Amino acid sequence: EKLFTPLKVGAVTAPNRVFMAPLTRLRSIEPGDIPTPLMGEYYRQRASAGLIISEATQISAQAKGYAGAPGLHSPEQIAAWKKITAGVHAEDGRIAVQLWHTGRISHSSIQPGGQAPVSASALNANTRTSLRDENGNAIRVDTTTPRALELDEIPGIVNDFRQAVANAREAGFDLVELHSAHGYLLHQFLSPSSNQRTDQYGGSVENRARLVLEVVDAVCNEWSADRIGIRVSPIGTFQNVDNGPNEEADALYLIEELAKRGIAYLHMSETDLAGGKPYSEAFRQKVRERFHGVIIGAGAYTAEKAEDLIGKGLIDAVAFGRDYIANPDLVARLQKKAELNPQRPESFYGGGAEGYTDYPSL
Numbered sequence: 001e002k003l004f005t006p007l008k009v010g011a012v013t014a015p016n017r018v019f020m021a022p023l024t025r026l027r028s029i030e031p032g033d034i035p036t037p038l039m040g041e042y043y044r045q046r047a048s049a050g051l052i053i054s055e056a057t058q059i060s061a062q063a064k065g066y067a068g069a070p071g072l073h074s075p076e077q078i079a080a081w082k083k084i085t086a087g088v089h090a091e092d093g094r095i096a097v098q099l100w101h102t103g104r105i106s107h108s109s110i111q112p113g114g115q116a117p118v119s120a121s122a123l124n125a126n127t128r129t130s131l132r133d134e135n136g137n138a139i140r141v142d143t144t145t146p147r148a149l150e151l152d153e154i155p156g157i158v159n160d161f162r163q164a165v166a167n168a169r170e171a172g173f174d175l176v177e178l179h180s181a182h183g184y185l186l187h188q189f190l191s192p193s194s195n196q197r198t199d200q201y202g203g204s205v206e207n208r209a210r211l212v213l214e215v216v217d218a219v220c221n222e223w224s225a226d227r228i229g230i231r232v233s234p235i236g237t238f239q240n241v242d243n244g245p246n247e248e249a250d251a252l253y254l255i256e257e258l259a260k261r262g263i264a265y266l267h268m269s270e271t272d273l274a275g276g277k278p279y280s281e282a283f284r285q286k287v288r289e290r291f292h293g294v295i296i297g298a299g300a301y302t303a304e305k306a307e308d309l310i311g312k313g314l315i316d317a318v319a320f321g322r323d324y325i326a327n328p329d330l331v332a333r334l335q336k337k338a339e340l341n342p343q344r345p346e347s348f349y350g351g352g353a354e355g356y357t358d359y360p361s362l
């Protein structure tokens with residue numbers, strides 16, 4: 001067994017390789033997209049994780065795409081997150097904040113000025129996002145058609161990520177994870193299916209990866225490379241955003257570029273919750289030889305699969321999502337081979353304490 005052995009992750013050291021995957025729960029306070037004491041308790045309960053990766057958090061108000069998702073751009077948000085990270089640390093844990101811009105997976109009603117959300121191109125995501133009704137309950141709504149970002153607006157996006165990282169540092173986070181997956185803004189630019197731009201941000205893979213790499217350079221400069229992690233989902237289709245006809249080659253290009261920055265980690269979301277083709281060991285080898293930091297595998301992993309790939313030296317840690325929602329002490333359970341609490345999917349999004357902080361520990 002290696003899941004319970006230490007691992008150097010950038011500027012921090014995880015005591016085990018059982019990580020908590022970033023999980024949107026949409027329980028923040030509105031107005032203000034403010035983290036709550038309940039959220040602090042939720043994270044505190046899971047502080048034994050090798051590393052806790054927070055729910056996706058807005059880098060700006062424009063980044064918002066889901067009612068209930070927290071932000072890390074306002075004073076009130078920073079003050080709230082400081083309490084959450086302090087609680088995790090009081091329990092000897094480590095926490096990274098996942099930062100995102102939802103791009104076209106949003107709705108005009110939650111955008112500043114009630115205007116259309118932005119993206120690489122003016123193409124509807126053709127999916128749904130979550131809003132709240134008059135009683136605060138989570139509801140699904142079709143996504144609003146986006147406006148294509150003007151070339152001169154791009155620097156602003158990079159600056160928003162940079163500022164969000166500066167705020168993350170002050171908020172007490174140990175690391176930050178750039179959300180470059182699952183069809184959100186950064187992925188919208190990376191994918192040819194969602195990017196039809198004819199300027200230097202569209203077309204070739206070099207052009208498509210331009211934005212995410214500018215963001216990476218900006219945040220490394222703002223804080224430190226060993227404080228930066230990034231999540232990608234470069235193989236398969238996610239929320240209607242595929243990865244092009246040369247997904248494997250383009251993925252290796254991106255990974256090689258990221259490696260040049262010497263960032264803390266590469267987090268690979270292998271499949272959509274709906275499933276997808278499994279990574280071949282050959283591909284895992286090509287990815288491993290191109291990145292020199294920690295590699296985190298994720299996507300319906302089993303303890304056995306984690307041990308198998310960590311043992312083969314293909315990955316360093318595993319991020320568990322749904323098992324962490326239902327098991328605050330997942331580490332102890334996996335170590336003791338204890339049974340897990342049953343999952344209650346109906347309370348994954350929105351609501352309150354029920355289905356959030358009421359899953360018992362051993």
Ligand SMILES: Cc1cc2nc3c(=O)[nH]c(=O)nc-3n(C[C@H](O)[C@H](O)[C@H](O)COP(=O)(O)O)c2cc1C
Pocket residue numbers: 021022023024025054055056098179181182231269273298299300301319320321322323348349
């Ligand atoms: C309720 C829910 C919310 C999620 N929110 C996020 C998110 O904020 N950021 C992200 O990168 N992935 C998100 N994911 C994906 C998970 O991080 C994870 O990759 C996925 O659930 C597959 O892993 P699992 O089989 O261990 O649950 C979400 C998944 C679930 C079920």
